[PDB]
Design a protein around this nucleic acid. Structure first.
Ligand SMILES: [Mg+2]
Ligand SMILES: [Mg+2]
Ligand SMILES: [Zn+2]
Ligand SMILES: [Zn+2]
Lengths: 72, 926, 132, 125
RNA sequence: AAGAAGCUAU
RNA sequence: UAUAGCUUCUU
């Protein structure tokens, strides 16, 4: 259940990067720190809390239609 | 009784408190430098021949001052008084008192030395050249007693560490003035001995920490005016401590006073030769060997090392802006230029170019390449830089903006991950886990990585030991041939690599190899043998799988450097990689039985054998410049018939100016590299091996010379130690008949397998336990005092069972498996590495397994030896890869049969999902 | 003969690779949300649903117990679902409301908000709170 | 085919020669021929270290500040002295290349800027 | 043996 | 940068 979290974190950081998030230096720094922390984690609780913190970054923007992609 | 303490306390108004018991002698454990026709070494011996009393300042507080009283004989009691009467007027001679006392019925002579320090200089040198983190009480006491720190500073664990807690350098630098005053008093004592004739040998243990000399038991008279002190062992053993404690810091102040402002030099001054000569004549006056401030005047590389060692120390007191390329204005068709016509090395001096053209009519292609390759023109037209993010020297900014380069994450290969999970992989509690990923980096990563050159510090070496070590190391490279080749015989592969700055703005190595003819390349190479060509190195971040964040950078050196270094080093580098059965195993493959052959060659015929392997913390950043110079000189001994002294020196200067102190570009800005190795050079992996072998030989020399010679049962090893000490500190020339013997002794009891900064040693366990060969502790101390790093014993392994192979070598493990009928050694990787390489990729088109089926074939070739592992979870990786290859082919066939209306009649692709194509890669005879 | 077969294999490979990198964004987003759904975490699911219907955060969600979090509420139904008096429930945690301002940057008190009186302020409020 | 490949190589040799020679002549026009000449005319021989050319003749300075504490002690105010010379600020940008104002650089508003800050100044006579 | 291309590991 | 190995095509 940790490999799934790490793979999804990798994909989330890829999505954020291709959404042009590195144009902002501090936001990119925070995202990179969270992504690297998730990979090196050892317990699922801290990994999941960091994962939600990093997903909040993508949710706060408006460049990814959420309802359309949640069409199951 | 209270009469010996009253006579010892003569008319001096001193209050003494006994340290022993009455008149009974006091036994101590102190370091000595002994050579007395029966024992030789720098070791720790028991000293019980003197009674020691302590002096109290006032009230009831003890101070650091002792009254050592000795009792040897009657004949010596007159000789040491006759010598003292001649040396009594010197200010560097400890006050002596002579008196006669009766113990029971005899009049025992006594010699008293007044107001001595608890420890001597030999103790200070031994504590720092034989450092043990678990037993360092002498060093702690010396540090605390002289107000370097407080007793609580040692509660901070990792205090000794250099990489961590770099305040230990500031703590150590608190003994610099004490060491400097000791050196001054040594010079005074040498002059006093020279006057009236007191010819004798100066030893470290005969001087206390105040700088006073007190032992005259081995001196002999002579005609006043001609007396020679012997100061080889003293200075040579004290050399490494003069840079750790920064002894000569006070030489940069106005009147050599630490309370006055720093001397201010003219910004245009670069020669500094008279100052170097004055420093040498002030601190090392009786060192009996000519010193050349500029190494261009040296006689051979053995003299170049000797003089560069002194330059390393003397150059720490001069402004850092006086080092680097020396530029001047030339006129090309009348329009002024600014070019580099020299160089000022901290180690080689003030080298000057010989082919400077002040007036030119045209500008050829070779001249164009030379001029648009040095930093003079780029920096002269740049902007001033004050980068506050790093402590490294900054030269100029070549633009108006600062570049912040980042690293992106990896690419998830979801199909392979789903396939692996569907076959019971990554289950909770499994032994196979994902540990290697693609880590991302922000804009500060490049400068953060560059600022790791703060681990490079000016290191002074023990020259009398380094010379012998280099002579022994040169024997490991005898079975090779080298020399200079022509432009035709250069075999360059991958012509589409980088060309460095500024040449990467117009093309790759292909554009410059195709543009220049053979005549132009030969002319450029011959130019570098008479002139120095500074170049610029470009740093970039790399995109690869790893197990730590640890941003990684790749350096690309300019074409003008590689093109000329190839014609100098290619023959030797290609001969090193074509030899099997040697210590250096570069170029030896692990397939077709290579790993077994290498393992059985390292094992050789050692007795009571064990296996050991160590680590080099921050190898590329902390390596001292002297060791890099030594490696470069050792690799250039093949040019004994194709180059002269001047040609070889100028090639060495070019190497130093191009790959050792070059100007590095990072984010569109120019900095100054203090030292270390660069990954962009072709000779890095070959100089790393020389440095590794040099360190391994120094460890053995230190292990053998620091052993009590009276406890060595074998009569051959004892004489070997005696003659080793003699060849180091008492014989100023090369002894081949002993270099050969030491090389044979090391090869029989200390077998190594070296690949750059990676080694495996099979040694004689009994000898290592008796202190006759090196162990891990010797490596720790050697690295501490010669590399400015602490080597944790947790990063080093040991293996008593030789049938289980080395624990790790080149990131691979060893297993003794059964192939056919015999038993062989096979290397296998970390399963997590293979799984991560399969699951995460660095390109979106590599995530479609159908278009890339050879990636998995190559990955399964490396994962085969896992099928013979006892663990069944490790052995499933090979089968998973085979199944994935089969499924990929099955899917690709259908995809091609639908996208088109054709199918391959014959494929011959079934060999890749069967366990024979991969099993044949580890069987010999191919 | 083989010349033609190997030519077709090269042509197919070029067609696929040129199409693999021509659909990176949509494929990556689809994969990310498929994996997020498969993870099935309450903390992630709550925020995903809230962002889907009404609630989107204005800054990275803090993990400490003191850092401030600001959220966006589109209407009153989301306020009922997520806001119950003086307590805020978001991302599987308890948040205490500290200050609410309507869409025109005019401060608003909690007691004012109700159902009938909802159509009297700039609805897209901005609620701030701190972790328990 | 040998002749065609040689012609391509012979063409690229002149193509890169112009680039190398054009770069060198462009840098000639950025050299302060009357300020860089003063220091060279003072050297006892004519040779000077390359490290003191930008230090004593450059007309523009660029400072990279990691945080506000370093800004306070290095480039505070409008004019600051570095390398025994007086420099006057001209512009300030952050890690995103946006223009920053000296008023926004405070100890309370500090945690709102992309902090790697590049301060460019002009030598004042 | 010469090459031209692709890939994997150290 | 250097080393080693695998697959394809031409001479
Ligand atoms: Mg003695
Ligand atoms: Mg290893
Ligand atoms: Zn010399
Ligand atoms: Zn040569």
């Amino acid at each position: 259940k940790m490999s799934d979290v790490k793979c999804t974190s990798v994909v989330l950081l890829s999505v954020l990067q291709q959404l042009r998030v590195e144009s902002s230096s501090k936001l990119w720094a925070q995202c990179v720190q969270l992504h690297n922390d998730i990979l090196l984690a050892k317990d699922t609780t801290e990994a999941f809390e960091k994962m939600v913190s990093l997903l909040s970054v993508l949710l706060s923007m408006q460049g990814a239609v959420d309802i359309n992609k949640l069409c199951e | 009784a209270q009469s010996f303490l009253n006579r010892v306390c003569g008319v001096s108004a001193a209050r003494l408190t006994p340290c022993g018991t009455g008149t009974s002698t006091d036994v101590v454990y102190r370091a000595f430098d002994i050579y007395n026709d029966k024992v030789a070494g720098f070791a720790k011996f028991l000293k019980t021949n003197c009674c020691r009393f302590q002096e109290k300042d006032e009230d009831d507080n003890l101070i650091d001052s002792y009254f050592v009283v000795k009792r040897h004989t009657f004949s010596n009691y007159q000789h040491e008084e006759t010598i003292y009467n001649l040396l009594k007027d010197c200010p560097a001679v400890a006050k002596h008192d002579f008196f006669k006392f009766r113990i029971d019925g005899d009049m025992v002579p006594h010699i008293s030395r007044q107001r001595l320090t608890k420890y001597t200089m030999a103790d200070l040198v031994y504590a720092l050249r034989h450092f043990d983190e678990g037993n360092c009480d002498t060093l702690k006491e010396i540090l605390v007693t002289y107000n370097c720190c407080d007793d609580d500073y040692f509660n901070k664990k990792d205090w000794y560490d250099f990489v961590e807690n770099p305040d230990i350098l500031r703590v150590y630098a608190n003994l610099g003035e004490r060491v400097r005053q000791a050196l001054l008093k040594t010079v005074q004592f040498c002059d006093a001995m020279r006057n009236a004739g007191i010819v004798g040998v100066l030893t470290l243990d005969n001087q206390d920490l105040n700088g006073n000399w007190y032992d005259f038991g081995d001196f002999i008279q002579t005609t006043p005016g001609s007396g020679v002190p012997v100061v080889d062992s003293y200075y040579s053993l004290l050399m490494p401590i003069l840079t750790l404690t920064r002894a000569l810091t006070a030489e940069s102040h106005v009147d050599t006073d630490l309370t006055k402002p720093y001397i201010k030099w003219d910004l245009l001054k670069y020669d500094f030769t008279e100052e170097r000569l004055k420093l040498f004549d002030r601190y090392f006056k009786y060192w009996d060997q000519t010193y050349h401030p500029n190494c261009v005047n040296c006689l051979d590389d053995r003299c170049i090392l000797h003089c560069a060692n002194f330059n390393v120390l003397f150059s720490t007191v001069f402004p850092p802006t006086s080092f680097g390329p020396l530029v001047r204005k030339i006129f090309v068709d009348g329009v002024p230029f600014v070019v580099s016509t020299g160089y000022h090395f901290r180690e080689l001096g003030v080298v000057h170019n010989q082919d400077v053209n002040l007036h030119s009519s045209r500008l050829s292609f070779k001249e164009l390449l030379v001029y648009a390759a040095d930093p003079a023109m780029h920096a002269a037209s740049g902007n001033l830089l004050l980068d506050k993010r790093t402590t490294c020297f900054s030269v100029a900014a070549l633009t108006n903006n600062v570049a912040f380069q980042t690293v992106k994450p990896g690419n998830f290969n979801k199909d392979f991950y789903d396939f692996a999970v569907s076959k019971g992989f990554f289950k909770e509690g499994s032994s196979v886990e994902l540990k290697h990923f693609f880590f991302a980096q922000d804009g500060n990563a490049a400068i953060s990585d560059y600022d790791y050159y703060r681990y490079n510090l000016p290191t002074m070496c023990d020259i009398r030991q380094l010379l012998f070590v280099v002579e022994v190391v040169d024997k490991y490279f005898d079975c090779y041939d080298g020399g200079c080749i022509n432009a035709n015989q250069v075999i360059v592969n991958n012509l589409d690599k980088s060309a460095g700055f500024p040449f990467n703005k117009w093309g790759k190595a292909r554009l410059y190899y195709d543009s220049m003819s053979y005549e132009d390349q030969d002319a450029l190479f011959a130019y570098t043998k008479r002139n120095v060509i500074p170049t610029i190195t470009q740093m970039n971040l790399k995109y690869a799988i790893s197990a730590k964040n640890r941003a990684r950078t790749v350096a690309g050196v300019s074409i003008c450097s590689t093109m000329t270094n190839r014609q100098f080093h290619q023959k030797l580098l290609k001969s090193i990689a074509a030899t099997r059965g040697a210590t250096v195993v570069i170029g030896t493959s692990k397939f077709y039985g290579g790993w077994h052959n290498m393992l059985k060659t390292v094992y050789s015929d050692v007795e009571n054998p064990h296996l050991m392997g160590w680590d080099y913390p921050k190898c590329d950043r902390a390596m001292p410049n002297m060791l890099r110079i030594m490696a470069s000189l050792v690799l250039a001994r093949k040019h004994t018939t194709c180059c002269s002294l001047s040609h070889r020196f100028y090639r060495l200067a070019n190497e130093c100016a191009q790959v050792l102190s070059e100007m590095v570009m990072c984010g569109g800005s120019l900095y100054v590299k203090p030292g270390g190795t660069s990954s962009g050079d072709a000779t890095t992996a070959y100089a790393n091996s020389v440095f590794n072998i040099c360190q391994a030989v120094t460890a053995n020399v230190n292990a053998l010379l620091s052993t009590d010679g009276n406890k060595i049962a074998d009569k051959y090893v004892r004489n070997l130690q005696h003659r080793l000490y003699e060849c180091l500190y008492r014989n100023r020339d090369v002894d081949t008949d002993f270099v050969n013997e030491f090389y044979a002794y090391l090869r029989k009891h200390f077998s190594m397998m070296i690949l750059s900064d990676d080694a495996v040693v099979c040694f004689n366990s009994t000898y290592a336990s008796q202190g006759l060969v090196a162990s891990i502790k010797n490596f720790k101390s050697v690295l501490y005092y010669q590399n400015n790093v602490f080597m944790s014993e947790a990063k080093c392994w040991t293996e008593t069972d030789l049938t289980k192979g080395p624990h790790e070598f080149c990131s691979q493990h060893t297993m003794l498996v059964k192939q056919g009928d015999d038993y062989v050694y096979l290397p296998y990787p970390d399963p997590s590495r293979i799984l991560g390489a399969g699951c995460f990729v660095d390109d979106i088109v590599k995530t479609d397994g159908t278009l890339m089926i050879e990636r998995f074939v190559s990955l399964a070739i490396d994962a085969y030896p896992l099928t013979k592992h006892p663990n069944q979870e490790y052995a499933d990786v090979f089968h998973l890869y085979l199944q994935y290859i089969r499924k990929l082919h099955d899917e690709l066939t259908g995809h091609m049969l639908d996208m088109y209306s054709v199918m391959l009649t014959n494929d011959n692709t079934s060999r890749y999902w069967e366990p024979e194509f991969y099993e044949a890669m580890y069987t010999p005879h191919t | 003969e083989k010349m033609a077969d190997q030519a077709m294999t090269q042509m197919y490979k070029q067609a696929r690779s040129e199409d693999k990198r021509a659909k990176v964004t949509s494929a990556m987003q689809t994969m990310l949300f498929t994996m997020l759904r498969k993870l099935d975490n309450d903390a992630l699911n709550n925020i995903i649903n809230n962002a889907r219907d009404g609630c989107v955060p204005l800054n990275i969600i803090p993990l400490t117990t003191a850092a401030k979090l600001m959220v966006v509420i589109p209407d009153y139904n989301t306020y009922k679902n997520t806001c119950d008096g003086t307590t805020f429930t978001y991302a599987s945690a308890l948040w205490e409301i500290q200050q609410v301002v309507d869409a025109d940057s005019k401060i608003v008190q909690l007691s004012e908000i109700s159902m009938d009186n909802s159509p009297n302020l700039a609805w897209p409020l901005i609620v701030t709170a701190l972790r328990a």
